[PDB]
Amino acid sequence: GVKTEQEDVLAKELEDVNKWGLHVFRIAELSGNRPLTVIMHTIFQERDLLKTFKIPVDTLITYLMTLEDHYHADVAYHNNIHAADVVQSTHVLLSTPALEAVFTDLEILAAIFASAIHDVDHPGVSNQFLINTNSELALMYNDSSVLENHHLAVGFKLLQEENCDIFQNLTKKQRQSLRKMVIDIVLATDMSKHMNLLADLKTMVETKKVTSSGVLLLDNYSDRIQVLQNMVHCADLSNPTKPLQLYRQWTDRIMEEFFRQGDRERERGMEISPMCDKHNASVEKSQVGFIDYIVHPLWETWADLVHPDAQDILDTLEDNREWYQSTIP
Protein backbone atom coordinates (compact mmCIF):
# COMPACT_ATOMS: atom_id res chain seq x y z
CA GLY A 1 0.00 0.00 0.00
CA VAL A 2 3.07 2.13 -0.23
CA LYS A 3 4.79 3.58 -3.24
CA THR A 4 7.82 2.16 -5.01
CA GLU A 5 11.00 4.26 -4.80
CA GLN A 6 10.57 5.55 -8.38
CA GLU A 7 6.99 6.58 -7.47
CA ASP A 8 8.47 8.41 -4.42
CA VAL A 9 11.13 10.24 -6.35
CA LEU A 10 8.33 11.22 -8.82
CA ALA A 11 6.09 12.33 -5.94
CA LYS A 12 8.80 14.60 -4.66
CA GLU A 13 9.41 16.33 -8.10
CA LEU A 14 5.60 16.82 -8.17
CA GLU A 15 5.78 18.94 -5.05
CA ASP A 16 6.98 21.65 -7.47
CA VAL A 17 3.61 21.43 -9.38
CA ASN A 18 2.62 24.89 -8.15
CA LYS A 19 5.91 26.56 -9.34
CA TRP A 20 6.94 28.21 -12.53
CA GLY A 21 9.93 26.15 -13.81
CA LEU A 22 8.91 22.63 -12.72
CA HIS A 23 11.36 20.01 -13.97
CA VAL A 24 8.89 18.71 -16.51
CA PHE A 25 11.39 16.60 -18.53
CA ARG A 26 12.51 14.98 -15.30
CA ILE A 27 8.83 14.25 -14.52
CA ALA A 28 8.48 12.67 -17.95
CA GLU A 29 11.40 10.31 -17.30
CA LEU A 30 10.42 9.45 -13.76
CA SER A 31 6.82 8.68 -14.87
CA GLY A 32 7.71 6.24 -17.66
CA ASN A 33 6.72 8.90 -20.20
CA ARG A 34 3.46 9.84 -18.41
CA PRO A 35 3.97 13.47 -17.55
CA LEU A 36 0.52 14.55 -18.80
CA THR A 37 -1.30 11.90 -16.73
CA VAL A 38 0.56 12.41 -13.52
CA ILE A 39 0.53 16.22 -13.70
CA MET A 40 -3.21 16.29 -14.66
CA HIS A 41 -3.99 13.85 -11.86
CA THR A 42 -2.01 15.90 -9.35
CA ILE A 43 -3.75 19.13 -10.40
CA PHE A 44 -7.22 17.52 -10.32
CA GLN A 45 -6.59 16.20 -6.72
CA GLU A 46 -5.09 19.49 -5.56
CA ARG A 47 -7.95 21.58 -6.93
CA ASP A 48 -10.54 19.05 -5.68
CA LEU A 49 -11.95 18.58 -9.19
CA LEU A 50 -12.83 14.88 -8.76
CA LYS A 51 -15.26 15.56 -5.88
CA THR A 52 -16.59 18.76 -7.31
CA PHE A 53 -17.46 17.13 -10.63
CA LYS A 54 -18.09 13.62 -9.30
CA ILE A 55 -15.41 12.21 -11.64
CA PRO A 56 -14.63 8.58 -10.81
CA VAL A 57 -10.90 8.23 -10.31
CA ASP A 58 -10.43 5.11 -12.56
CA THR A 59 -12.35 6.92 -15.36
CA LEU A 60 -9.95 9.94 -14.95
CA ILE A 61 -6.89 7.76 -15.14
CA THR A 62 -8.26 5.78 -18.12
CA TYR A 63 -9.08 8.98 -20.05
CA LEU A 64 -5.76 10.61 -19.24
CA MET A 65 -3.74 7.57 -20.32
CA THR A 66 -5.79 7.35 -23.48
CA LEU A 67 -5.39 11.06 -24.12
CA GLU A 68 -1.62 10.91 -23.56
CA ASP A 69 -1.22 7.93 -25.93
CA HIS A 70 -2.79 9.99 -28.73
CA TYR A 71 0.06 12.47 -28.52
CA HIS A 72 2.84 11.34 -30.95
CA ALA A 73 5.97 10.21 -29.08
CA ASP A 74 7.75 10.51 -32.49
CA VAL A 75 7.15 14.24 -32.72
CA ALA A 76 9.86 16.27 -31.00
CA TYR A 77 7.97 19.28 -29.75
CA HIS A 78 4.19 18.82 -29.98
CA ASN A 79 4.00 15.79 -27.84
CA ASN A 80 2.73 14.85 -24.39
CA ILE A 81 5.53 16.68 -22.58
CA HIS A 82 4.50 19.98 -24.21
CA ALA A 83 0.88 19.16 -23.27
CA ALA A 84 1.91 18.52 -19.68
CA ASP A 85 3.90 21.74 -19.58
CA VAL A 86 1.04 23.86 -20.93
CA VAL A 87 -1.36 22.29 -18.40
CA GLN A 88 1.02 22.95 -15.52
CA SER A 89 1.74 26.57 -16.66
CA THR A 90 -2.02 27.23 -16.94
CA HIS A 91 -2.40 25.80 -13.53
CA VAL A 92 0.12 28.32 -12.10
CA LEU A 93 -1.39 31.20 -14.03
CA LEU A 94 -4.86 30.41 -12.61
CA SER A 95 -3.40 30.77 -9.16
CA THR A 96 -2.20 34.32 -9.74
CA PRO A 97 -3.14 36.70 -6.82
CA ALA A 98 -4.77 39.15 -9.21
CA LEU A 99 -7.35 36.46 -10.26
CA GLU A 100 -8.02 34.98 -6.78
CA ALA A 101 -11.59 33.77 -6.46
CA VAL A 102 -12.42 35.20 -9.94
CA PHE A 103 -13.18 31.95 -11.83
CA THR A 104 -15.77 29.27 -11.12
CA ASP A 105 -14.80 25.59 -10.83
CA LEU A 106 -16.30 24.92 -14.29
CA GLU A 107 -14.12 27.63 -15.82
CA ILE A 108 -11.08 26.23 -14.10
CA LEU A 109 -11.92 22.69 -15.43
CA ALA A 110 -12.40 24.20 -18.92
CA ALA A 111 -8.99 25.93 -18.87
CA ILE A 112 -7.15 22.87 -17.58
CA PHE A 113 -8.97 20.30 -19.81
CA ALA A 114 -8.39 22.71 -22.72
CA SER A 115 -4.65 22.84 -21.96
CA ALA A 116 -4.50 19.05 -21.71
CA ILE A 117 -6.10 18.40 -25.11
CA HIS A 118 -4.86 21.47 -26.96
CA ASP A 119 -2.37 19.76 -29.25
CA VAL A 120 -3.50 16.15 -29.19
CA ASP A 121 -2.63 14.03 -32.26
CA HIS A 122 -0.37 16.77 -33.62
CA PRO A 123 1.55 15.40 -36.62
CA GLY A 124 4.60 17.70 -36.16
CA VAL A 125 3.87 19.99 -39.14
CA SER A 126 2.02 23.30 -39.49
CA ASN A 127 -1.37 24.31 -40.73
CA GLN A 128 0.17 25.87 -43.83
CA PHE A 129 2.04 22.63 -44.44
CA LEU A 130 -1.17 20.59 -44.19
CA ILE A 131 -3.05 22.95 -46.45
CA ASN A 132 -0.29 23.02 -49.13
CA THR A 133 0.12 19.25 -49.23
CA ASN A 134 -3.61 18.72 -49.75
CA SER A 135 -3.75 16.60 -46.64
CA GLU A 136 -6.91 14.98 -45.37
CA LEU A 137 -6.96 17.14 -42.20
CA ALA A 138 -6.92 20.34 -44.21
CA LEU A 139 -9.65 19.04 -46.43
CA MET A 140 -11.75 17.93 -43.47
CA TYR A 141 -11.68 21.35 -41.88
CA ASN A 142 -11.95 23.40 -45.10
CA ASP A 143 -8.47 24.84 -44.45
CA SER A 144 -9.61 26.82 -41.36
CA SER A 145 -7.58 26.37 -38.04
CA VAL A 146 -6.96 22.86 -39.29
CA LEU A 147 -4.92 21.49 -36.41
CA GLU A 148 -6.81 23.25 -33.65
CA ASN A 149 -10.12 21.87 -34.92
CA HIS A 150 -8.58 18.40 -34.99
CA HIS A 151 -7.11 18.68 -31.46
CA LEU A 152 -10.60 19.49 -30.16
CA ALA A 153 -12.36 16.73 -32.06
CA VAL A 154 -9.90 14.08 -30.89
CA GLY A 155 -9.92 15.31 -27.27
CA PHE A 156 -13.70 15.13 -27.18
CA LYS A 157 -14.03 11.91 -29.16
CA LEU A 158 -11.75 10.07 -26.76
CA LEU A 159 -14.34 10.58 -23.99
CA GLN A 160 -16.36 7.87 -25.83
CA GLU A 161 -13.77 5.15 -25.27
CA GLU A 162 -14.29 2.52 -22.67
CA ASN A 163 -14.54 4.06 -19.15
CA CYS A 164 -13.23 7.38 -20.49
CA ASP A 165 -16.24 9.68 -19.93
CA ILE A 166 -14.85 11.94 -17.25
CA PHE A 167 -17.83 14.30 -17.60
CA GLN A 168 -20.47 11.56 -17.19
CA ASN A 169 -21.91 13.16 -13.98
CA LEU A 170 -22.11 16.73 -15.20
CA THR A 171 -25.58 18.05 -16.10
CA LYS A 172 -26.38 18.91 -19.63
CA LYS A 173 -26.08 22.64 -18.83
CA GLN A 174 -22.65 22.08 -17.31
CA ARG A 175 -21.45 20.06 -20.29
CA GLN A 176 -22.76 22.59 -22.84
CA SER A 177 -21.00 25.44 -21.04
CA LEU A 178 -17.84 23.48 -20.56
CA ARG A 179 -17.68 22.37 -24.17
CA LYS A 180 -18.18 25.86 -25.54
CA MET A 181 -15.42 27.34 -23.29
CA VAL A 182 -13.04 24.49 -24.30
CA ILE A 183 -13.63 25.02 -27.93
CA ASP A 184 -13.22 28.83 -27.62
CA ILE A 185 -9.98 28.37 -25.72
CA VAL A 186 -8.30 25.81 -28.01
CA LEU A 187 -9.31 27.68 -31.16
CA ALA A 188 -7.51 30.72 -29.68
CA THR A 189 -4.28 28.72 -29.72
CA ASP A 190 -4.04 29.11 -33.50
CA MET A 191 -1.28 31.73 -34.02
CA SER A 192 -3.23 33.39 -36.75
CA LYS A 193 -5.52 34.62 -33.93
CA HIS A 194 -2.64 36.03 -31.91
CA MET A 195 -2.85 39.67 -33.00
CA ASN A 196 -6.54 40.00 -32.39
CA LEU A 197 -6.31 38.28 -29.06
CA LEU A 198 -3.45 40.61 -28.04
CA ALA A 199 -5.46 43.71 -29.14
CA ASP A 200 -8.42 42.61 -27.02
CA LEU A 201 -6.16 41.98 -24.08
CA LYS A 202 -4.57 45.50 -24.53
CA THR A 203 -8.06 47.03 -24.71
CA MET A 204 -8.95 45.18 -21.51
CA VAL A 205 -5.92 46.47 -19.64
CA GLU A 206 -6.82 50.06 -20.66
CA THR A 207 -10.40 49.65 -19.43
CA LYS A 208 -9.44 47.61 -16.43
CA LYS A 209 -11.76 47.52 -13.45
CA VAL A 210 -11.08 45.83 -10.14
CA THR A 211 -12.91 44.83 -7.04
CA SER A 212 -12.30 45.16 -3.36
CA SER A 213 -8.96 43.34 -2.88
CA GLY A 214 -7.80 44.49 -6.26
CA VAL A 215 -8.65 41.40 -8.18
CA LEU A 216 -9.96 41.83 -11.67
CA LEU A 217 -13.63 42.30 -12.32
CA LEU A 218 -14.94 40.30 -15.29
CA ASP A 219 -18.68 40.49 -15.47
CA ASN A 220 -19.57 39.14 -18.96
CA TYR A 221 -18.66 35.97 -20.90
CA SER A 222 -16.75 37.95 -23.43
CA ASP A 223 -14.29 39.26 -20.94
CA ARG A 224 -14.15 36.10 -18.90
CA ILE A 225 -13.41 33.92 -21.91
CA GLN A 226 -10.97 36.47 -23.28
CA VAL A 227 -8.90 36.17 -20.15
CA LEU A 228 -8.93 32.38 -20.19
CA GLN A 229 -8.07 32.29 -23.88
CA ASN A 230 -5.13 34.67 -23.39
CA MET A 231 -4.10 32.68 -20.29
CA VAL A 232 -3.76 29.37 -22.15
CA HIS A 233 -2.13 31.11 -25.05
CA CYS A 234 0.45 32.62 -22.57
CA ALA A 235 0.98 29.12 -21.29
CA ASP A 236 1.39 27.88 -24.86
CA LEU A 237 3.96 30.60 -25.46
CA SER A 238 5.67 30.28 -22.08
CA ASN A 239 8.87 28.49 -23.04
CA PRO A 240 11.06 31.59 -23.23
CA THR A 241 9.84 32.68 -19.82
CA LYS A 242 11.21 29.51 -18.22
CA PRO A 243 14.77 29.03 -16.87
CA LEU A 244 17.16 28.54 -19.62
CA GLN A 245 17.91 24.80 -19.08
CA LEU A 246 14.19 24.34 -19.86
CA TYR A 247 13.95 26.95 -22.57
CA ARG A 248 16.86 25.48 -24.59
CA GLN A 249 15.39 21.99 -24.52
CA TRP A 250 12.17 23.45 -25.92
CA THR A 251 14.09 25.35 -28.59
CA ASP A 252 15.98 22.19 -29.66
CA ARG A 253 12.78 20.33 -30.02
CA ILE A 254 10.94 23.03 -31.86
CA MET A 255 13.90 23.31 -34.21
CA GLU A 256 14.05 19.54 -34.78
CA GLU A 257 10.38 19.52 -35.74
CA PHE A 258 10.82 22.50 -37.92
CA PHE A 259 14.02 21.32 -39.73
CA ARG A 260 12.20 18.07 -40.22
CA GLN A 261 9.32 19.87 -41.86
CA GLY A 262 12.10 21.10 -44.32
CA ASP A 263 13.15 17.51 -45.34
CA ARG A 264 9.55 17.03 -46.38
CA GLU A 265 9.20 20.68 -47.70
CA ARG A 266 12.04 19.89 -50.21
CA GLU A 267 9.84 17.39 -52.10
CA ARG A 268 6.20 18.44 -51.54
CA GLY A 269 5.73 21.66 -53.66
CA MET A 270 6.57 24.71 -51.58
CA GLU A 271 9.91 26.39 -51.26
CA ILE A 272 10.76 26.39 -47.51
CA SER A 273 9.47 28.63 -44.62
CA PRO A 274 11.75 31.50 -43.38
CA MET A 275 14.34 30.83 -40.61
CA CYS A 276 13.76 27.06 -41.01
CA ASP A 277 16.97 25.86 -42.65
CA LYS A 278 20.39 25.20 -41.15
CA HIS A 279 21.28 26.23 -44.72
CA ASN A 280 20.81 29.92 -43.88
CA ALA A 281 18.67 30.15 -40.75
CA SER A 282 20.20 31.08 -37.40
CA VAL A 283 18.41 29.56 -34.36
CA GLU A 284 19.38 32.42 -32.06
CA LYS A 285 18.01 35.24 -34.25
CA SER A 286 14.80 33.34 -34.58
CA GLN A 287 14.46 33.18 -30.81
CA VAL A 288 15.21 36.90 -30.47
CA GLY A 289 12.61 37.69 -33.11
CA PHE A 290 10.07 35.36 -31.53
CA ILE A 291 10.55 37.08 -28.24
CA ASP A 292 10.55 40.68 -29.56
CA TYR A 293 7.58 40.38 -31.88
CA ILE A 294 5.40 37.77 -30.17
CA VAL A 295 6.21 36.58 -26.68
CA HIS A 296 7.30 39.79 -25.02
CA PRO A 297 4.41 41.98 -26.21
CA LEU A 298 2.01 39.26 -24.99
CA TRP A 299 3.65 38.60 -21.66
CA GLU A 300 4.20 42.34 -20.99
CA THR A 301 0.46 42.90 -21.57
CA TRP A 302 -0.44 39.88 -19.40
CA ALA A 303 1.94 41.36 -16.77
CA ASP A 304 0.04 44.69 -16.82
CA LEU A 305 -3.31 42.82 -16.41
CA VAL A 306 -2.15 40.99 -13.26
CA HIS A 307 0.48 43.64 -12.07
CA PRO A 308 2.72 42.98 -10.05
CA ASP A 309 2.18 39.17 -10.12
CA ALA A 310 4.08 38.45 -13.40
CA GLN A 311 7.32 40.50 -12.80
CA ASP A 312 9.66 37.55 -12.17
CA ILE A 313 8.40 35.77 -15.25
CA LEU A 314 8.79 38.89 -17.39
CA ASP A 315 12.32 39.41 -15.88
CA THR A 316 13.33 35.89 -16.95
CA LEU A 317 11.94 36.45 -20.36
CA GLU A 318 14.11 39.60 -20.63
CA ASP A 319 17.25 37.77 -19.37
CA ASN A 320 16.73 34.85 -21.76
CA ARG A 321 16.30 37.39 -24.56
CA GLU A 322 19.67 38.99 -23.69
CA TRP A 323 21.30 35.57 -23.51
CA TYR A 324 20.15 34.57 -27.00
CA GLN A 325 21.12 38.06 -28.34
CA SER A 326 24.66 37.75 -26.89
CA THR A 327 25.18 34.43 -28.71
CA ILE A 328 24.67 36.03 -32.18
CA PRO A 329 28.21 36.17 -33.75
Ligand SMILES: COc1ccccc1COc1cc(C2=NN(C3CCN(c4ncnc5ccsc45)CC3)C(=O)[C@@H]3CC=CC[C@@H]23)ccc1OC
Ligand atom coordinates in the same frame (compact mmCIF):
# COMPACT_ATOMS: atom_id res chain seq x y z
C1 LIG B 1 10.21 32.89 -35.86
O1 LIG B 1 10.13 31.98 -34.77
C2 LIG B 1 10.48 30.71 -35.02
C3 LIG B 1 10.75 30.23 -36.29
C4 LIG B 1 11.09 28.91 -36.46
C5 LIG B 1 11.19 28.07 -35.38
C6 LIG B 1 10.93 28.55 -34.11
C7 LIG B 1 10.57 29.88 -33.91
C8 LIG B 1 10.30 30.42 -32.54
O2 LIG B 1 10.43 29.32 -31.65
C9 LIG B 1 9.27 28.80 -31.14
C10 LIG B 1 8.08 28.87 -31.83
C11 LIG B 1 6.91 28.35 -31.29
C12 LIG B 1 5.73 28.54 -32.17
N1 LIG B 1 5.93 28.99 -33.35
N2 LIG B 1 4.85 29.15 -34.14
C13 LIG B 1 4.93 30.23 -35.15
C14 LIG B 1 5.43 31.53 -34.57
C15 LIG B 1 5.47 32.58 -35.63
N3 LIG B 1 6.23 32.14 -36.81
C16 LIG B 1 7.19 32.90 -37.41
N4 LIG B 1 7.56 32.58 -38.65
C17 LIG B 1 8.48 33.34 -39.26
N5 LIG B 1 9.09 34.41 -38.75
C18 LIG B 1 8.71 34.75 -37.49
C19 LIG B 1 9.22 35.84 -36.72
C20 LIG B 1 8.60 35.94 -35.53
S1 LIG B 1 7.49 34.67 -35.23
C21 LIG B 1 7.77 34.03 -36.81
C22 LIG B 1 5.78 30.87 -37.37
C23 LIG B 1 5.77 29.81 -36.33
C24 LIG B 1 3.72 28.38 -34.00
O3 LIG B 1 2.79 28.50 -34.76
C25 LIG B 1 3.68 27.44 -32.84
C26 LIG B 1 2.26 26.93 -32.56
C27 LIG B 1 1.61 27.62 -31.41
C28 LIG B 1 2.29 28.18 -30.44
C29 LIG B 1 3.77 28.12 -30.38
C30 LIG B 1 4.31 28.30 -31.74
C31 LIG B 1 6.96 27.74 -30.04
C32 LIG B 1 8.16 27.66 -29.35
C33 LIG B 1 9.32 28.19 -29.88
O4 LIG B 1 10.55 28.18 -29.28
C34 LIG B 1 10.64 27.68 -27.96
Ligand SMILES: [Mg+2]
Ligand atom coordinates in the same frame (compact mmCIF):
# COMPACT_ATOMS: atom_id res chain seq x y z
MG1 LIG C 1 -1.29 24.06 -31.16
Ligand SMILES: [Zn+2]
Ligand atom coordinates in the same frame (compact mmCIF):
# COMPACT_ATOMS: atom_id res chain seq x y z
ZN1 LIG D 1 0.88 24.00 -27.96
